[PDB]
Nucleic acid binder design. Structure first.
Lengths: 127, 59, 99, 207, 152, 81, 113
RNA sequence: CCUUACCUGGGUUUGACAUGCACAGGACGCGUCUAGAGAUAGGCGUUCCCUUGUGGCCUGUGUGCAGGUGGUGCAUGGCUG
RNA sequence: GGGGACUCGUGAGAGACUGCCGGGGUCAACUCGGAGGAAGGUGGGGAUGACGUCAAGUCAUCAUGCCCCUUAUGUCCAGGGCUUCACACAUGCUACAAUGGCCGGUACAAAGGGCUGCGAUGCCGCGAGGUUAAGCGAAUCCUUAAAAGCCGGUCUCAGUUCGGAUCGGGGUCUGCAACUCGACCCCGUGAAGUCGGAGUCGCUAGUAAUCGCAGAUCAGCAACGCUGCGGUGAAUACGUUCC
């Protein structure tokens, strides 16, 4: 019944149903400043275009899950974007045209037989 | 061989001195435990269809 | 009121699905109260090996033992149907062991 | 070298697994027997025309499905030879083993059996080209298949310098996976060693 | 590749006072993916630049950037046999990023003190027309005007 | 750096050396053992160790207790020119 | 700021200052300094005699240093030499002993060409 | 160690194994002296089957053979790049 | 407990195919740009290696013709050696420190494995390790704390607090056995070496780079190799004149 968070990630997916409130978007003490020392993923989550001050403020932080690497965990803003779609469609063209209604599910290329993780071909010799 | 195979099959005298062989075609080196095979005849069986769903991946 | 925990060890989603839903449905027909099928994670024991016989190459192949356990359910203690459960099982391809 | 057995891709597409059982620890106990079982059964049944052997291991007994062209050869004197190879193998397989001899309705459809037959023809000191024409002709006239490739490799007449050649007829599109291309082969002894042949039968595609 | 260029991955404004230039700077000083760290380092340079200058580090980088940045390369491609190099005009983006690359390299040199401190040193020298990267611009212009031939 | 539970000596030789300790030292004893550990009880007993090629005589002292017969049985050959 | 050798640094941690003794590393430095109750980071400029007395006493009570220590080492080395086993033989020829291959490497032991 | 095919040296040498023709009748296992080990060597445990003929089968004899990581990819298959 | 809402797991479908707008273009082929949409024009990737070639390679995986041995070129066995070095070459690990070493604290994987086994918890030991032992033949038990990262501190540009190679001593493990010839840990020295000639490989998007993880093999030795997973996460591409 509450706004079901839905959004992708790089490996450890983050999402939960949420309700509106103050705008106290944190979990288990892990505020944006505790979980994201850097302001990059903090602000990406803030979704400056649509913040808790731009629209109905929300408190229920997207449940972490999969541990959550400090990089990819910022991907929950996809969850926010979908939550906003659940609110209304007015910013769906704003968010899609902005660049928030996409995929970003990229992981890593499979390790190949004779190569490394990052296809690091060895020092060949043409003689 | 045909004698050193029997010897390899020989159980007693310090089982660490015993030596695991393919037992299908005979192969000392590069023998996988569970299948117990030389990893060559394994390939032939892999193509034959003698496994319980051991297929080539396609990741 | 559950007693019977099913465990099936297959390696073919199609086989375990098609055969389990029918034998389980017939167990229900005999009068047992049964929990719906439970899709469980899949298992794969992967192997990689050289193709060359003399083995003077880096050319490799990659196999995987696709062990499939899913739709593993639970049956309520209904002896008159448990007897049939014991007498009727699935092919060896699906290893039936029940608690 | 750079060619495969199509069954290796159709393992769970169109083909079946010959090993019909699930095992964790006893798995090795099963296959270590499957080697001798298959070798001893295959040996001596040349007249039978052994296409394939499928094996189920269950009820503490082995059930063997023999895809053979000539059941009467495996049976022998009303089962005397079949029991010779079955009853005596009960102590090795693990308490009782049961044969189930299958009759191949049209052996010509079996890449393995055509391969064996024509290779034996070459072991009868016949003209290679004529042998190939005969084998292929019967293996495309009597079957309702969509194609064939028969590739032979060896001395071909007992030449010091060996070689190979093939007579493709119809289609054999191996690069496509939905194709139903049966595959078999046979390695026949000759005066100067032995000569191999592989057979592909573009039987159909898929249900 | 040859014909048909590929779009670059867009960059955005820094979480501090908005600047794609600084964002690019971070991407240019990124080492081993420690990108949050790089941001910490740059922000340290902002703090040192404002501590040293009393003004917006970013615009001191604008002055430093234009001071360092050249607009004329001294090498295009192979011409013939004994022909050396033929200079040719450079587009703003590559010129800009070269300047930044010079600043980083010489900041990496000078085994004196912290990277933030030596960066701050290079920043003010560059903004004041003193950086060796500006001396590289000088080298660009002096070494240029040589084989004023067909600009491939 | 193992066998914390006492020196390991090949039993069939250990017994013989024990008898020799009971009577007196005896002539150089051949033996195919490159692993028995030297102990103080072996001091005064010169005996030969198969070194992969032949049994080579060697005398024991206290300084040798931390050494094996294989340490007293050289196998490879270095330079010679 | 002296016990046996020079042991005279400036602007160093005390345990590192102790690392100037042939026979005492960081571990032993922390063990004795812990025994004295003296901080690991303390420069020579702030030292007194009582501290040197405690340190001296604990060193004498705990281990040996060069001259005595190295002489014990040379006694062990000569023991290896006089034994003449494979190990001593590697020491005798300047060859490595701890399972090395001089064929390609062991250039510290063999020296450069 | 084995692995190891190489070798020092030691033993065996129809053999470690498969297996044909005769004879022979326990095999085999246990434990133990010897010996570095192999094996030697003693003593135990012992031939079912109807070694009733056949059957089982080691051992021993003799012989078919066994066996060979011996060579021969410039005989060759197969497989691989 | 209770629930099936999500996630998750997982069977089967839809969905992207130039489908589509406008424009161009031999109207066709084909293509520019664009809407929608999650992706727009073989999404990405893998498996897949045409016909054929190089007398490429292998009799030592296997198979096998000829020739050879077959009282031995077979067989059994202790031990040695395949692990040797005045030198050279190749592929690789780490450093040549302040985007740094160290003490202390601290959130976070994914994928795999484990009843011959995993060894939780708890005990002892400076530690490697040792004792006891739950649960687990496994989504639940264990493996399981991931590490890079982050708050703070120390050291403050040195062949030094870099670097841990060499070597001595002392401990742990496997195995009957660790010398030849194993692995690990504590102490101790703290080597060479301060960014690399000539020359050259690598690399276009979650890339490359970089830090960790877990398996196969094995009594033990895989925290440099090989095969899989995952974190962080760039830059350049005017262009085809030349190699």
């Amino acid at each position: 019944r509450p706004i079901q968070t839905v959004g992708r990630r790089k490996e450890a997916v983050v999402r939960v149903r949420l309700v509106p409130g103050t705008g106290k978007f944190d979990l288990n003490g892990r505020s944006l400043e505790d979980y994201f020392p850097n302001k990059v993923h903090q602000q990406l989550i803030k979704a400056p275009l649509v913040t808790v001050d731009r629209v109905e403020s929300f408190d229920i932080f997207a449940h972490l899950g999969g541990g959550g690497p400090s990089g990819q965990a910022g991907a929950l803003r996809l969850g926010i974007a979908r939550a906003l779609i659940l609110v209304s469609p007015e910013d769906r063209p704003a968010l899609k045209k902005a660049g928030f209604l996409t995929r970003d599910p990229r992981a890593t290329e499979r390790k190949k037989y004779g190569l490394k993780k990052a296809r690091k071909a060895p020092q060949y010799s043409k003689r | 061989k045909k004698a050193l195979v029997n010897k390899a099959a020989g159980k007693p005298r310090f089982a660490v001195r015993a030596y695991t062989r393919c037992s299908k075609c005979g192969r000392p080196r590069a023998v996988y435990r569970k299948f117990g095979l030389c990893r060559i005849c394994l390939r032939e069986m892999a193509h034959a269809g003698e496994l319980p769903g051991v297929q080539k991946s396609s990741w | 009121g559950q007693k019977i925990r099913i465990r099936l060890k297959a390696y073919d989603h199609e086989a375990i699905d098609a055969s389990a839903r029918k034998i389980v449905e017939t167990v229900v027909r005999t009068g047992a109260s049964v929990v719906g099928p439970v899709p469980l994670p899949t298992e794969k024991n992967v192997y990689c090996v050289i193709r060359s016989p003399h083995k003077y190459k880096d050319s490799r192949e990659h196999f995987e033992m696709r062990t499939h356990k899913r739709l593993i359910d639970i049956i309520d203690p209904t002896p008159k149907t448990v007897d049939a459960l014991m007498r009727i099982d699935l092919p060896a391809s699906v290893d039936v062991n029940i608690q | 070298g750079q060619k495969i057995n199509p069954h290796g891709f159709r393992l769970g597409i169109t083909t079946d697994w010959k090993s019909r059982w699930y095992a964790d620890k006893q798995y090795a106990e099963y296959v270590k027997e499957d080697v001798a079982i298959r070798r001893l059964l295959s040996s001596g049944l040349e007249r039978a025309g052994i296409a394939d052997v499928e094996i189920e291991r269950t009820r503490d007994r082995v059930r063997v499905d023999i895809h053979t062209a000539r059941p009467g050869i495996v049976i022998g004197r009303r089962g005397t030879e079949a029991d010779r190879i079955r009853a005596d193998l009960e102590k090795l397989t693990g308490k009782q083993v049961q044969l189930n001899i299958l009759e191949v309705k049209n052996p010509e459809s079996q890449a393995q059996l055509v391969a064996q037959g024509v290779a034996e023809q070459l072991s009868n000191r016949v003209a290679f080209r004529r042998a190939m024409r005969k084998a292929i002709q019967s293996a495309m006239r009597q079957p309702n298949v969509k194609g064939i490739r028969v590739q032979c490799s060896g001395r071909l007449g007992g030449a010091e310098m060996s070689r190979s050649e093939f007579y493709r007829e119809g289609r054999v599109p191996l690069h496509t996976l939905r194709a139903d291309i049966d595959y078999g082969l046979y390695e026949a002894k000759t005066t100067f060693g032995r000569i191999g042949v592989k057979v592909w039968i573009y039987k159909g595609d898929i249900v | 590749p040859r014909k048909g260029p590929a779009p670059k991955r867009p960059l955005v404004n820094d979480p501090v006072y908005g600047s794609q230039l600084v964002t690019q700077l971070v991407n240019k000083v990124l080492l081993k993916g420690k990108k949050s760290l790089a941001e910490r380092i740059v922000y340290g340079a902002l703090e040192q630049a404002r501590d040293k200058t009393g003004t917006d580090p970013v615009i001191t980088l604008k002055r430093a950037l234009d001071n360092v940045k050249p607009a004329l390369e001294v090498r295009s491609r192979r011409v013939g046999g004994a022909t050396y190099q033929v200079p040719v005009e450079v587009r703003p983006d590559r010129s800009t990023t070269l300047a930044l690359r010079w600043l980083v390299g010489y900041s990496r040199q000078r085994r004196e003190k912290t990277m933030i401190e030596r960066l701050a040193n290079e920043i003010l020298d560059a903004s004041n027309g003193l950086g060796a990267s500006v001396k590289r611009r000088e080298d660009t212009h002096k070494m240029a005007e040589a084989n004023r031939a067909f600009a491939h | 750096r193992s066998l914390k539970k006492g020196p390991f000596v090949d039993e069939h030789l250990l017994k013989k050396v024990d008898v020799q300790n009971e009577k007196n030292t005896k002539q150089v004893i051949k033996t195919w053992s490159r692993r028995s550990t030297i102990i103080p009880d072996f001091i005064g007993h010169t005996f030969a160790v198969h070194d992969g090629r032949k049994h080579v005589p060697v005398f024991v002292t206290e300084s040798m207790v931390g050494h094996k017969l294989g340490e007293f049985a050289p196998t490879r050959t270095f330079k010679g020119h | 700021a002296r016990l046996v050798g020079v042991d005279l640094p400036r602007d160093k941690r005390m345990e590192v200052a102790l690392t100037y003794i042939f026979g005492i590393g960081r571990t032993r430095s922390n063990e004795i300094l812990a025994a004295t109750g003296i901080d690991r980071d303390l420069r020579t400029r702030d030292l007194t005699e009582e501290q040197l007395i405690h340190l001296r006493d604990y060193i004498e009570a705990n281990l040996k240093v060069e001259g005595d220590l190295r002489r014990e080492v040379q006694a062990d080395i000569r023991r290896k030499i006089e034994i003449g086993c494979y190990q001593g033989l590697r020491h005798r020829r300047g060859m490595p002993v701890r399972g090395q291959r001089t064929k390609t490497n062991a250039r510290t032991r063999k020296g450069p060409k």
